[PDB]
Amino acid sequence: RTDDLVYLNVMELVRAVLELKNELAQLPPEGYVVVVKNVGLTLRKLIGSVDDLLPSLPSSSRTEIEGTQKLLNKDLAELINKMRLAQQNAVTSLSEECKRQMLTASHTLAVDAKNLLDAVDQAKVLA
């Protein structure tokens, strides 16, 4: 884009999700919370910028976008649960698997962010 906000926003969340692997390896367990809080905040920002530019779109394809938005919050809620397991097992031999499931949740949150991008995108069918 040249001024698309919802896009730049989606690309931010995708970037924050992309930065997770290195951070879980350089941060102590205590720090995993702040990292996910950022993903958390970047998501809320996005979900918000979409809600604003939502009434400017066909009052039809609205049930479709609201559909992914609810999906995203589901995604984050799961990422948090995983992150909590990732913590409780910081010094057990289940560390790697916990982190692995954390990253898997994060990847699906970006995949869903991208699906959201596309939905609101194609939604330029109105004007």
Domain ranges of the chain: 1-127
Nearest alpha-carbon partner for 67 in 54, 81, 56, 80 = 54
Q: Is the dihedral of CA 10, 42, 116, 74 positive or negative?
A: positive
Query: Within a 13 Å sphere around the CA of 55, how many CA atoms are in the beta-carbon half?
Result: 1
Report how far apart, in Å, the C-alpha atoms of 65 and of each of 15, 59, 75 are.
Answer: 21, 11, 15
Say which amino acid occupies 35: V
Euclidean distance between CA atoms 107 and 39, whole angstroms: 12
Query: Within a 13 Å sphere around the CA of 111, how many CA atoms are in the beta-carbon half?
Result: 7
Helix (H, G, I), strand (E, B) or coil at 4: coil
Experimental determination technique: X-ray
Please tell me what resolution, in angstroms, this structure has. 2.7
What is the architecture, at CATH level 2, of domain 1-127? Up-down Bundle (1.20)
Euclidean distance between CA atoms 114 and 111, whole angstroms: 5
Euclidean distance between CA atoms 61 and 59, whole angstroms: 6
Question: What are the helix and strand counts (H, E) for the chain?
Answer: 5, 0
Euclidean distance between CA atoms 119 and 66, whole angstroms: 10
Identify whether the C-beta of residue 14 lies closer than 8 Å to the C-beta of residue 113.
yes
